[PDB]
């Protein structure tokens, strides 16, 4: 019984990066080179694991995180990065064991006049901890005057829209991202490859 990767990679709606989705995968058999060999992804970088050997490995659990960002922000989805996304939206740990998979999704995600459903967090007092999801909408206080939930000067809604639009700038176009984390605990290894 296969792992529900298709449920993650082939979902027709993706989350905003600030509210990234996470499917916890377990008790299944995963053919990774289904993804490895399809060659549909502009990005497929793995850390702490050899992508081909993955079908020989077992893990306690696998986590699939998914979301949409800009093409030129996909570099921030990696261990040791800085920036809007790395700092305030989705943060990988320095000791990351998993794979980062991305592909251009302009066809599905760019809406004429601006697709204002995809957002990112723009203001935040402090960097995210790794694998932290912050969905706060509190009004961000940039001044000494408390905002009391009312927007205004120095009182900013913390989220910005991408407004993904038909644009000939590739970097500005939306990409769908899937991050695979591989968890190995002192428990049964319920997520195994074909070879074991």
């Amino acid at each position: 019984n296969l792992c529900p990767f298709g449920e993650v990679f082939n979902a027709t709606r993706f989350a905003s990066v600030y509210a990234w989705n996470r499917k916890r995968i377990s008790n299944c058999v995963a053919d990774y080179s289904v993804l490895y060999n399809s060659a549909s992804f502009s990005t497929f970088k793995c850390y702490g694991v050899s992508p081909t050997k993955l079908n020989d490995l077992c893990f306690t659990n696998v986590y699939a995180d998914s979301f949409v960002i800009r093409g030129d922000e996909v570099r921030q989805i990696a261990p040791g990065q800085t920036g809007k996304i790395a700092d305030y939206n989705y943060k990988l740990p320095d000791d990351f064991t998993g794979c980062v998979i991305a592909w251009n999704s302009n066809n599905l995600d760019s809406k004429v006049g601006g697709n204002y459903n995809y957002l990112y967090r723009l203001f935040r007092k402090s960097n995210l901890k790794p694998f932290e999801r912050d969905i706060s909408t509190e009004i961000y206080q940039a001044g000494s005057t408390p905002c009391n939930g009312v927007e205004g000067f120095n009182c900013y809604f913390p989220l910005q829209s991408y407004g993904f639009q038909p644009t000939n700038g590739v970097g500005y176009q939306p990409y769908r991202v899937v991050v695979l984390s591989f968890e190995l605990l002192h428990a049964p290894a319920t997520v195994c490859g074909p070879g074991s």
Partner: antibody
Amino acid sequence: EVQLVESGGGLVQPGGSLRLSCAASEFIVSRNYMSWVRQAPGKGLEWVSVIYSGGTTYYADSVKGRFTISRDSSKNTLYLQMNSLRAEDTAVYYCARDRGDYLFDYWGQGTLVTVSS
Amino acid sequence: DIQMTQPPSPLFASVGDRVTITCRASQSISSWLAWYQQKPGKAPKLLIYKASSLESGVPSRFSGSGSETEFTLTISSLQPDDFATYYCQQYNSYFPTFGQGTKVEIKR
């Protein structure tokens, strides 16, 4: 009310150093994107450096390795440490609140830095 | 980098004229464009972000338009205090850059 006041500018020889200073009011430096932007005499505008509220900092390639942006939230102050100054660094240095994504919606009036031998 | 080109200075207009200042990005920046106004001896002040949204405070005679690689600032009826320099600036990329600026001086 809201204010950004630069100081520390002046005349310095090539190879010298200078620490710029930006005292803010009502703006809280440590909660904002704080930037330095400079303007050579009669020239245009050149972004220099940013410090995110979360700590991340970036620099124009023309100043990498030589300038260092920093802040003291005890004093609600932004700093720019300029080392190994060259004559091409001569400019008015502006302190600007970056309202996210390098959108400078408030500029201090600036402090001039002349690098010359 | 992305290089922003504006027209050369000066631009000559009279109080009441309609003035358009163009801006040309060397590559597509979608709509991430800003407009600043600067008087001599004074710091810039922001007028237009996201290409067409008036900064809160800026008089309504100021308007912005464009996308991709060509943009436009427009003063419907130029006022006496609108004689200044206007810079465009692409933001929301890894490194921001400004155009060289266009100065609007008095017509005679």
